[PDB]
Amino acid sequence: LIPTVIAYDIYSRLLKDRIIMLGSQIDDNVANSIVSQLLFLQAQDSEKDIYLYINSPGGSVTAGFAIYDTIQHIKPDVQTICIGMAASMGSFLLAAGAKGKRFALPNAEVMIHQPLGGAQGQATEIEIAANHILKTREKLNRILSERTGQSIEKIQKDTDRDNFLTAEEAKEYGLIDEVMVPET
Amino acid sequence: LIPTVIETTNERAYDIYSRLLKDRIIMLGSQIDDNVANSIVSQLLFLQAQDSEKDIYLYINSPGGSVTAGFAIYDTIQHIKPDVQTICIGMAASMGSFLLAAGAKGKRFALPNAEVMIHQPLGGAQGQATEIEIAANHILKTREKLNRILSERTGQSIEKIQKDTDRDNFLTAEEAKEYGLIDEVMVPET
Amino acid sequence: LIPTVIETTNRGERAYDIYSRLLKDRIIMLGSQIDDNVANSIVSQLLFLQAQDSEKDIYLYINSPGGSVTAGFAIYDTIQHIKPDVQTICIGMAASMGSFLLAAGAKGKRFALPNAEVMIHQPLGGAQGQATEIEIAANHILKTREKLNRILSERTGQSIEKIQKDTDRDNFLTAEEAKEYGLIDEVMVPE
Amino acid sequence: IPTVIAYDIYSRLLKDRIIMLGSQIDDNVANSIVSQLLFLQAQDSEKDIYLYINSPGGSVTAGFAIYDTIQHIKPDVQTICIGMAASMGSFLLAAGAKGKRFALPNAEVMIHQPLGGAQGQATEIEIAANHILKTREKLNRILSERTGQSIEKIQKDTDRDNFLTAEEAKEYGLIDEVMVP
Amino acid sequence: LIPTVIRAYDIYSRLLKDRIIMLGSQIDDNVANSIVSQLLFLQAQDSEKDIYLYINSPGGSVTAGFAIYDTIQHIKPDVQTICIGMAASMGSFLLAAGAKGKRFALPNAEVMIHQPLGGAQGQATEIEIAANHILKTREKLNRILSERTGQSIEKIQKDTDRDNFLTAEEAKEYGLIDEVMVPE
Amino acid sequence: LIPTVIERAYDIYSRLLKDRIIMLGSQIDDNVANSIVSQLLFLQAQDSEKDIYLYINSPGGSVTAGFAIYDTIQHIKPDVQTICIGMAASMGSFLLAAGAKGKRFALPNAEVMIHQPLGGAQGQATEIEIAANHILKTREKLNRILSERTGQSIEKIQKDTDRDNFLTAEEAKEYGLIDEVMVPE
Amino acid sequence: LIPTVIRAYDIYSRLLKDRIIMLGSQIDDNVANSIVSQLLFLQAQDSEKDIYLYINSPGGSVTAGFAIYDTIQHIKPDVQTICIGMAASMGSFLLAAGAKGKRFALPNAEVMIHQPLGGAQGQATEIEIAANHILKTREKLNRILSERTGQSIEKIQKDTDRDNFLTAEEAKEYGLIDEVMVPETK
Amino acid sequence: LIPTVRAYDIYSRLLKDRIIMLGSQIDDNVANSIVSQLLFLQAQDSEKDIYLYINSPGGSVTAGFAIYDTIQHIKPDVQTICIGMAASMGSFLLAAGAKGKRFALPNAEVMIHQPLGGAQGQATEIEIAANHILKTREKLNRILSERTGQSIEKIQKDTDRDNFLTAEEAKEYGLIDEVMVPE
Amino acid sequence: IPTVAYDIYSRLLKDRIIMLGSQIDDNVANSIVSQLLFLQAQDSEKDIYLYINSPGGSVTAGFAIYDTIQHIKPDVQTICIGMAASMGSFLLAAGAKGKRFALPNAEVMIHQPLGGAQGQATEIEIAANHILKTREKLNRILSERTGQSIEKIQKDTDRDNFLTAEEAKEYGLIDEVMVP
């Protein structure tokens, strides 16, 4: 049961202050919702910052790029904050936040790897599927290189296997700008 | 949950997608079945009734689906008076890319990292030889119907469409523009 | 998720789900497989609309693969019973009992959009158990076909003999071929 | 399967040149029958072989393995339908040596068009459709040759399930005699 | 069926009106997203007043737990923790994460601690990556648990090797809570 | 399933909560415990002096979830009356015995059952040992509290809870699980 | 029920006594091992006399097929290939692998040729490896099938893109077999 | 149906001429059988060569090492011949044949990769499983280095992913000695 | 299973070789126990050879094999080929003193016994006491045959402990590593 506040559900109350929740696996439904929220908020105010909360294991690459392109297209800066974890396409979207406004809390987990998929059937069908996922990885690595400041060659090497980063290591890597440390 | 948006009135609450429909935006954000087609067809009929002059905006993030359900949407877009803009965000595959190509001439768009896929229709038949023949003749005629309309809306020949849609053909937004499926790749606002 | 529409009136904002808004302008949706629930709803909508106005036309949207013959005949009989002319429009597809109901619209007011698909075939069914039980089931589905073909003959203008031959297997028709056959009156071309 | 003084019943029948087609026709059944036919040819090229048919048919290719082997070998292969011959089994019943195709009085003979399935792309469905259509043409041409009926008549008579009595099968040309007591 | 109280509040939403958040289930990303959003909502309402985290949980996801942990430490209000029924694993970790001097348990509440659980599959290098990750996760957990209990990291490692059930009184002695809240 | 009553419209159970009646009418899991614990905190905040009425028609369930309800009953100031209607089995009968002194009731044909706690253990011998020591502790914890509230000895409870022990309303009164059999007028 | 013949042989073991091997099922490793072992046994009995490989098979494992293929080529005796019923995929490859001039099909036998089928699942680089493997396997198959049919590699590529069913006579024209085996004289 | 050829089943006849079949996935049942055949054949004759046929996708590493150790323990040379395919522990055993007597037919497929496994439970239990499989890989890679003549660094890198090799490439790599060409 | 007339394992049994090459259940125990009794009846002085390629299994089934090895007069040699784990490693250690072997790459695993218990608290207690006694029984015997203390065996069997053949020899589970 998601609690009510007064009548907003808790997540709708957060959207009132320009906070969007990416708190699940990324499919087309999640992407359609977030994309729509981004369009609504920029229509309300094109100057004020938007805040993208990220607690996600990733998911669909095309659904992820739906969110990515909408972030870049709109005028407002979209801040990103990783709380809990950002894995796979979640960490890609974390790195896609406005330059200087990509954050994570100290114990947040960031993971990067190569895209996952499958193919079955004739040899030429397997080839088409293989060329597709390789082009998709090159596309992902190229953008990640541009937003982190790392070389495409280094991204390729570091995303070959599952690579778990602490929030601080994600800052060192260039996936975020600051680790949001708590007040004593 | 579908997020609720609330705006200060002289406080009115909307579900996000109904609020988008208020500004003439229709969401094609799922696999195309009869239910999705009926909704989109009804929305198109509602918006043209509200205003026959103002543009309609069809958001497309779909893997495609039913060809007949797709043609329900297609024919309704062609029948109504206002221009239907199409924008691919995320992906448009199969019937989804067909509907992307069906948007108003000069108003078919995609964001730079959107994926466009085209291929021949999928189906199945089972039973007697004459039943398989009927099913085969039907899906072949459906492909001719699709390819002929794609040729008209892209400028590509029916022979080239046949060859390019024989297997899965993935296109970038820029390649989709070059192919004639869209008119412009939308680049970021300043 | 059915989208909501918001109309401003002189009393205030009025919210409708999209399909209920269309019902306000006498548009009924047959947009699914025909079962008893779908027939019960459509039959009730027809009775509601004729009570509001017995002269005005009603519009039956048809995007259906067909389904139950008895549920189809619930809709058919209610269309013929009420005073209002029921226009039918095929958008997407009309197959089996869906195409039967497309042909059941008011004379001169049966439509299809250019790329809509119309299919006609003989009814489907099953029988299991004793020889006498299989006989009863076979006689029942055969009389149901004669019933369907007789009414389809009357509404298309085709003979019962020609309808029998043409519905022996799956027979897919274009919107123009459906017009030529007599299943619809006009193809509604775009302006 | 009982033993007889020591042979299993079907191996004893094979000793007297009798082959059992008593099940659905798959590749395993075809491989067995084809091998038995070749074996019986080597034992004696002159003496008749007797193919017992109680079968609902099955695989068309597996059926043609049996068909071609029957027409290839030197000995005449008598066919006898006991119980039923359907589809490919009734095709093989008709494949027996001219004048030596039989059925018992209450045996059931059924003929229909070949059954199959296709799934995937439109061009793949087209290929499967052209395949099964040409397979029917191949079956109907051979059935026309062996029954004496026209290809046009067989096409119409195999459109749906067509059940025949033993006497009707004789009149059709699927068999030569109804074997009385 | 959750009962309602009359504005109409479901019982949990009514408790949120008095700054009480419920952690009453297995910790997954949905529970974390909700609790994190409630913590942000309550500190926005008032940054001085105490928040009260009810804990009846068997634990669950370590990343989802750390989403709640970091959000507790980030916000200005003291987050009190009270164990009613049980707190195990990540739930007992979040119990120890409460404001200093404001971590409670009712007399018959059960507190359990152990090392984190997981799974690994595939190639030898993939298994190595999974093992190094879950070992770093335990070090990360034991470090924080050491600081908040006052026990040595060597002692935490030993006592979390197997399932270790503790009474409310034993949890106070261990440093997981501050007081056993006895009935007046 | 649940009917509405109008006066402000309430579902039947929410209307009962307005008169300080809490329903324990199902298997005791964490969700049921969380709900009841929240209702007890709501009612004591509304009025810390007026009685609360815990309806008990439960087969029991989770011991920790039961102890969530138990500890919340003992902590709050209001008297929590307990009334067994239908049945109170296992942890339900523990909570029936946990009601305010002199205000634990049962209707004449209500069923009260008591037994030892149920559980599981899998894996290594030391893991089984830890699991066995835990549930044995949990039983002592339950038996010690039952002893205090019933007036029966710990060793007597041990023997009487070894197997399933069904009791009538009158036998539950005689045992000390309830105070009165609430007879009809 | 495989019938016995009378020493008591099962029917297939009796056929092996006259140098006939049965490829009458889907090609898996078990079938390949048995056929490879039979081929080694028959060459040891007699290194000159022809072996007969009956083929009624829908194909199967490519590696299992190449176990059979390589053993045929390695041994001294000619392996006649005899298509009865049907030869599809790797079955039709093995049909084409029979001794030159001694590849047969019966008049109504079905021969089908198409590209190899497979699967890939996991990371992008794992999918790439699986794709490169099956593509190289196709080139290997096409190159050999080119050499034995007399058709160009690009013609084989085009004609095996989809399912391609050939009659016995069309298989002879294509070069997959040498003769449509006629009935024996009597 | 295994054909008959006294009357022997085909594989028993091959065993009479000292040919052992490794034609399936390597489990404990297959290893126990092959190990027993090796022990039987060396007892019949310690000097005459044994021939290990390999058409296997591999399987259990321990079951593979059962066969490996028995090959090295016995006096007779165990020839290895890859027909069809040798993958994983199957290709390890192909490389384990007598020096100069490891073969493959021209179109045989050879695959090498790192060992596969699983682990579940506590962090310390996962650690133990990780330490074990890594030791198993080093154990395997060291023997490959010795029998191929390649450096262990090269073996480590080349077995990181699935690495398919032709018969000629297997010869060049050192996994086999000759590609057995047809007469 | 190839033939040589004898099936391969029956031919090995003719030379007093018993195969423990599978998971240990009652059926495997009954077979091996019966082979041990049969081989004693054939010759009470000549050695028996127990091949061990097993992941272990039932402890009572393992103890059926153990007691029968100890009961009979002939020495029972044990050789680990492939792997011996759990009860398989226990039975490996139970072989005749000075005649317990393993090939170089053979794997030896030792760990505490696994079990399960469901129901009432007193039933869980009875199951827990039983498996604990079973561990004491196993550790006491493993102490006698390895030469290690009961405390060290308790420590080293708390978790999965994978040993090489040489490490198993050093531990006392075997006497010699058979070199080629």
Ligand SMILES: CC[C@H](C)[C@H]1C(=O)N(Cc2ccc(OC)c3ccccc23)C[C@@H]2N(C(=O)NCCCC(F)(F)F)CCC(=O)N12
């Ligand atoms: C940059 C937007 C450009 C300017 C353009 C457009 O091309 N679109 C397509 C579009 C649709 C759906 C979308 O994700 C759901 C879009 C996301 C990103 C970009 C375009 C999208 C429709 C858009 N509209 C609006 O935004 N109005 C404001 C009301 C928005 C809201 F949410 F409050 F109702 C209609 C008018 C218009 O011109 N546009």
Ligand SMILES: CC[C@H](C)[C@H]1C(=O)N(Cc2ccc(OC)c3ccccc23)C[C@@H]2N(C(=O)NCCCC(F)(F)F)CCC(=O)N12
């Ligand atoms: C336009 C086509 C012509 C004008 C005609 C018509 O033939 N029809 C059939 C129709 C039904 C359903 C449909 O998709 C659900 C139709 C879609 C496309 C075309 C026809 C469709 C009904 C139509 N109506 C309307 O459009 N009213 C306006 C109110 C619309 C809304 F949505 F707000 F209620 C009723 C009046 C009418 O004459 N028509």
Ligand SMILES: CC[C@H](C)[C@H]1C(=O)N(Cc2ccc(OC)c3ccccc23)C[C@@H]2N(C(=O)NCCCC(F)(F)F)CCC(=O)N12
């Ligand atoms: C022409 C119908 C005739 C006139 C008759 C009748 O025999 N019936 C049966 C009937 C029921 C349900 C039905 O589909 C749900 C019927 C459908 C078709 C015919 C009869 C049906 C009830 C009907 N009523 C009405 O029509 N009220 C008007 C208000 C209707 C609505 F929908 F707005 F509430 C009640 C009064 C009455 O006499 N009738």
Ligand SMILES: CC[C@H](C)[C@H]1C(=O)N(Cc2ccc(OC)c3ccccc23)C[C@@H]2N(C(=O)NCCCC(F)(F)F)CCC(=O)N12
């Ligand atoms: C001159 C006979 C045919 C045409 C010829 C031949 O081409 N083949 C191929 C063949 C194989 C399998 C077959 O169905 C299993 C065949 C079926 C039909 C035709 C050919 C077949 C092998 C055949 N053999 C025999 O017939 N030997 C006799 C022993 C038979 C048996 F069964 F007892 F062992 C070997 C010698 C030989 O020349 N042939």
Ligand SMILES: CC[C@H](C)[C@H]1C(=O)N(Cc2ccc(OC)c3ccccc23)C[C@@H]2N(C(=O)NCCCC(F)(F)F)CCC(=O)N12
């Ligand atoms: C300390 C918050 C910091 C200052 C900052 C921020 O960085 N965020 C990201 C964030 C998002 C989601 C979150 O858990 C759902 C966050 C949790 C913890 C920290 C940041 C989080 C958005 C935040 N906002 C607010 O809090 N406004 C008040 C309204 C809150 C509520 F809930 F009532 F609607 C927007 C303005 C702002 O500056 N911030």
Ligand SMILES: CC[C@H](C)[C@H]1C(=O)N(Cc2ccc(OC)c3ccccc23)C[C@@H]2N(C(=O)NCCCC(F)(F)F)CCC(=O)N12
């Ligand atoms: C009495 C306990 C003490 C006083 C303390 C407290 O420690 N807690 C923790 C607590 C949370 C959840 C609980 O079961 C859901 C608690 C149950 C028992 C004890 C504490 C619990 C919060 C409590 N609050 C209240 O009681 N407000 C009154 C409004 C309650 C309601 F329900 F109407 F909204 C907040 C203020 C406060 O100090 N407390």
Ligand SMILES: CC[C@H](C)[C@H]1C(=O)N(Cc2ccc(OC)c3ccccc23)C[C@@H]2N(C(=O)NCCCC(F)(F)F)CCC(=O)N12
């Ligand atoms: C011809 C190959 C060469 C000659 C060589 C050889 O390299 N091998 C490996 C081999 C094994 C298994 C095989 O398919 C199961 C082989 C298949 C093809 C090639 C080699 C094969 C063993 C072979 N043997 C025999 O052929 N003996 C004759 C007995 C045959 C039979 F079947 F009756 F028992 C042993 C002697 C020998 O030197 N060889």
Ligand SMILES: CC[C@H](C)[C@H]1C(=O)N(Cc2ccc(OC)c3ccccc23)C[C@@H]2N(C(=O)NCCCC(F)(F)F)CCC(=O)N12
């Ligand atoms: C080299 C083995 C050494 C010499 C020794 C030995 O230690 N063992 C253990 C052993 C068992 C099982 C095995 O794989 C099933 C063994 C495999 C490899 C090594 C030992 C094995 C028993 C062996 N025996 C034999 O060799 N018999 C000869 C006949 C065997 C056969 F197969 F023909 F029946 C008994 C005599 C003997 O001393 N040994």
Ligand SMILES: CC[C@H](C)[C@H]1C(=O)N(Cc2ccc(OC)c3ccccc23)C[C@@H]2N(C(=O)NCCCC(F)(F)F)CCC(=O)N12
């Ligand atoms: C040694 C035990 C003593 C000697 C005694 C005995 O008490 N028993 C019980 C027993 C049964 C089964 C067993 O594992 C299947 C036994 C195992 C171990 C001990 C006893 C066992 C039967 C035994 N027998 C034999 O040994 N016969 C010899 C033939 C044996 C074989 F295997 F070849 F057929 C019968 C005669 C006899 O007195 N005994």
